[PDB]
Amino acid sequence: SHSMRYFSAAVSRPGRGEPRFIAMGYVDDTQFVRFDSDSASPRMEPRAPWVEQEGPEYWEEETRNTKAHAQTDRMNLQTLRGYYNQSEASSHTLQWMIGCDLLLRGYEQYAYDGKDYLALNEDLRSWTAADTAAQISKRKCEAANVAEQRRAYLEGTCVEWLHRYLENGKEMLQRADPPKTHVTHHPVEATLRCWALGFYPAEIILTWQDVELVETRPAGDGTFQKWAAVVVPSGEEQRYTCHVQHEGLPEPLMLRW
């Protein structure tokens, strides 16, 4: 099941100058386009080999549209500052996300200072406000019938162009790298650490209540890593086994020291 997402972040910076606005697009866990207001030449630019080939119209429209997004969220930063009656010297963050999943479900959500603000429901015909301030934006969105404009994109363009990208980058987007695994022994009792290396996508299930589990991390080459540890009494090592569940592997393997 594949998906395409677009994200944006507007971070106000009093004194420092104008609000920063960054946006990017993803297909599954792979970034293909990026935009940063700080760049010397703010414009949407390729991040994945399979879309740089697109003609100059594409980049001209993507860039022109994305610049309009920056200006809008900059304007929103001040609108929301009013709703919450906030100082003009504090920094605030307005995050946006949109995407389509293969069409099974669409979405569009906004977040202010880390908390949910406004979200489009699954039905793509209604909104959900997180607080009283968001209720204003909700009524403004309902009275403006913008939902139709949003579902049109999610049902058409989003899905339409998603198929296009999924074919152009077939080598990169439809390939899963299995995890390289092994167990290590660390005498303290003793600690058993289970490793999963060089895998893709990032989703993975590692299991041994008292087990330490670190968030999955990027290796830096495009693959990910993750390990799980457990302190066990000497000689009781053999009673423990590590379970690794990953999409690349046909079935989930079980490891033991």
């Binding site: 677009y6 944006s8 946006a23 697009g25 386009v33 949407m44 594409y58 429209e61 993507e62 549209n65 994305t66 309009a68 997004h69 809008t72 969220d73 304007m75 929103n76 609108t79 929301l80 307005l94 946006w96 949109i98 569009e108 906004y110 603000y117 406004l118 934006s137 403004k140 969105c141 913008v146 404009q149 949003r150 994109y153 363009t157 989003c158 162009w161």
Partner: peptide, 9 residues
């Protein structure tokens, strides 16, 4: 392809 317009909260 990005949606051409951003919402006005």
């Amino acid at each position: 392809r990005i949606i051409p317009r951003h919402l006005q909260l």
